[PDB]
Amino acid sequence: NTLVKQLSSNFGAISSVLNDILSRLDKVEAEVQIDRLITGRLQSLQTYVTQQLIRAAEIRASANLAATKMSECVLGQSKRVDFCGKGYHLMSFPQAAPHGVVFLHVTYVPSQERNFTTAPAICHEGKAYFPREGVFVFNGTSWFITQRNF
Amino acid sequence: KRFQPFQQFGRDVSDFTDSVRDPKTSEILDISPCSFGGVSVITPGTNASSEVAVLYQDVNCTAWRIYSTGNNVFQTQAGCLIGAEHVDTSYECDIPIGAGICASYHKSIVAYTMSLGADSSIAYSNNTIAIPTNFSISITTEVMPVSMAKTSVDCNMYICGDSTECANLLLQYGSFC
Amino acid sequence: TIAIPTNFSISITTEVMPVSMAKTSVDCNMYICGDSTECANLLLQYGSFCTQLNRALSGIAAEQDRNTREVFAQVKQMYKTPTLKYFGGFNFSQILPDPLKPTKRSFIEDLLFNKVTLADAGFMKQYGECLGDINARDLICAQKFNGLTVLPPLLTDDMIAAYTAALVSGTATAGWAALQIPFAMQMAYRFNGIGVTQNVLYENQKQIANQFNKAISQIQESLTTTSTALGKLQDVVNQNAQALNTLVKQLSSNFGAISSVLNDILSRLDKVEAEVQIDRLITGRLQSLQTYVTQQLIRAAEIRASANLAATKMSECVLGQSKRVDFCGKGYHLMSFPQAAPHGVVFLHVTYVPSQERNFTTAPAICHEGKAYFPREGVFVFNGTSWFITQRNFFSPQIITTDNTFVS
Amino acid sequence: DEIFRSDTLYLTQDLFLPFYSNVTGFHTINHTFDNPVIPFKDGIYFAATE
Ligand SMILES: *[C@@H]1O[C@H](CO)[C@@H](O)[C@H](O)[C@H]1NC(C)=O
Ligand SMILES: *[C@@H]1O[C@H](CO)[C@@H](O)[C@H](O)[C@H]1NC(C)=O
Ligand SMILES: *[C@@H]1O[C@H](CO)[C@@H](O)[C@H](O)[C@H]1NC(C)=O
């Protein structure tokens, strides 16, 4: 619509209306004004094209990231942090949208944390028995081995 | 500035005449433009209200270079603000003024310092650790653009319309189409 | 034959990444036609290309604010400084604010800000001040008198420092909505994520802490002296200044007119004759403005690409352990710390580097009694006395047993 | 020109004497008196050491 509106503007010519110029001016005199208008209008077109190219680059960057998301999140489980949702990622579903895509991410969110006394290793009889990928926690009765979560 | 006898005017890099020798008294004078300073207008929408607030970036109102003084003139980090009430309370930055200052419509325009977020303290304990005992399943949405509208231009249509003489002039010009 | 390391080192490396650029606005009636009323009317009886240019520039400014928000506002809850600065032998001073020093920024942040020179300390210039200092050819006064303005950022530098302090405090306690774990204990978990066993961390804890504090001191000694480390976040600054001063200088040029000085033309020419020259000048100056705007848009796209990558780094490296190769440091990645910098962010990555490799004879499988006992994720090496089962990294020999291997 | 300028660099195209160019010397003493007719050739630079 901006391109449409720009036709009203003079570019140093007597009038923006070509028919008026051709109606009341002879060939040589009309040539000057018509050349001025031609220059201005070509310039407007070039500006529009340049802006379109920049917008297209942005949209290209957006489309590539969406394709990466579809490959990584929809067809797999991603261990990247916050790539396919805030919490621990389980699955994702795509839905189409006008000129775009909407992703639904399903995530696991821990809750109801409780505090225990923790040990890194157990002397037992003067030896070192390390947890092997778990935490040693004291429940109140005896020591137990647990995961980081749940 | 010191002017040699054969000089009468002085120019800067932009070629704007910035100095002049007075003919009668031969005293050198400096010429400066009158207009200077930045202005911004804050509104909550014409439909909601007709009132606006005005911010002057280059004025310190504790004055002279302001259009009018409606009410409550008070100095902020971003500049002198006219037409807004200051509030000590922190909020969520409806309209960003700048320099940590935001504005909102509460019925008057109000200006406040920006709120970063919730404040909490986590204890450090060598002998203690917290583990969850429950879990929840949350579903979140993400919206991402993929393509834009495809267009074409007929340059002979946009330029020269249906006129045959202008088309020939376009021809005896150049092919940037 | 196969070679396995027997020692390791802790290295700290830095990465500098731009986040935002300066926000600007243009008064086109100021830049074109000055205070002249006739040239303004001619501008009117020409066209409104001023609305488009300013729409583009305002979009750019909003984008810059958004970039900063996305890099630094990941953390929801703010986390107070613990006041102890010492956890399990690791010194976190010089990365956290010092109460004694009045400034809310850290020591390393102070060095980074000192290094980068900035054109404008403050965004206010008073008219009387420009008038008084006419003798000095101040570039900012010249920009302002010709309609070009720079706008302040929304988030002040102290706010960014507060965000970084909260992030570091969260890393020190709770790790990556709080876990509450002792520093040493978590560091044991990072080692597992690498593949090394926990007892390696627990046994040699003091040496690792000395090396870590030590790497911090070297970073500090490297930053205290002058280097081109922060060059990018300087190039960005010089580009903006250069573009504005170039616009200022371009007003001297004629564009086919008799003179570049409008007042001369209006003084010695009648309306109709002056119209031609003023139109030529108007065309040229509008063209200059459009070129400036286009270049700004391209620079903004580049800066946007840089900000997104920085946000990805903050999510992946600062709030987690990344298994990607070379994404968060050259060596095996353990942790990362962010520090604010003028118009950008600096990441400190801590990495595990193997060393002192030794060669052993290797076997893929053991015939034993005509059977196949495969290692189950370890290497069979011959020490000289008997065969042992080891990891790829940090050589620790263990007796071979049925549990260690799997039959097939 | 007759325009005043300070702290700036200014480019101009004009007739100048190029840097490190040849200049002819004429010396007048009791033994030798020199006053030949010399061409003008689009302007001249004339220096007297005396
Ligand atoms: C012009 O007239 C005034 C008043 O008589 C006088 O002071 C001034 O000197 C005159 N101009 C000059 C430069 O003589
Ligand atoms: C405004 O003026 C007052 C009084 O001169 C001064 O103390 C104050 O610092 C000024 N504010 C700014 C930010 O320039
Ligand atoms: C931590 O560093 C500071 C300054 O380098 C030092 O004085 C202190 O001794 C170190 N650790 C502690 C808390 O002893």
Residue numbers in the entry:
A (entry chain A): 942 to 1091
B (entry chain A): 543 to 604, 618 to 661, 672 to 742
C (entry chain C): 693 to 868, 874 to 1105
D (entry chain C): 44 to 93
Would you copy out the relevant sentences from the publication that reported this structure?
The trimeric spike (S) glycoprotein decorates the surface of coronaviruses and mediates entry into host cells. S receptor binding domain (RBD) comprises a free fatty acid (FFA)–binding pocket. FFA binding stabilizes a locked S conformation, interfering with virus infectivity. In the prefusion conformation, the RBDs in the S trimer can alternate between closed (“down”) and open (“up”) conformations.
To elucidate LA binding by SARS-CoV that emerged 2002, we determined the S cryo-EM structure. As before, we did not supplement LA during expression or subsequent sample purification and preparation steps. We analyze SARS-CoV S by cryogenic electron microscopy (cryo-EM) showing that LA-bound SARS-CoV S adopts a hitherto elusive locked structure sharing characteristics with LA-bound locked SARS-CoV-2 S, incompatible with ACE2 receptor binding. Locked SARS-CoV S is stabilized by LA occupying a bipartite binding site composed of two adjacent RBDs in the trimer. One RBD contributes a “greasy tube” lined by mostly phenylalanines accommodating the hydrocarbon tail of LA, and an adjacent RBD coordinates the polar headgroup of LA via residues R395 and Q396. LA binding to S also induces a profound conformational change in the loop comprising residue R620, which then engages in a cation-π interaction with Y819. Residue Y819 is part of the fusion peptide proximal region of the neighboring S subunit. This conformational rearrangement is completed by a π-π interaction of F305 and Y622 in the locked conformation. Another stabilization of the locked S trimer (and closed S trimer) is achieved by R1021 residues in each subunit, which form the center of a symmetric H-bond cluster, cation-π interactions with F1024, and salt bridges to E1013.
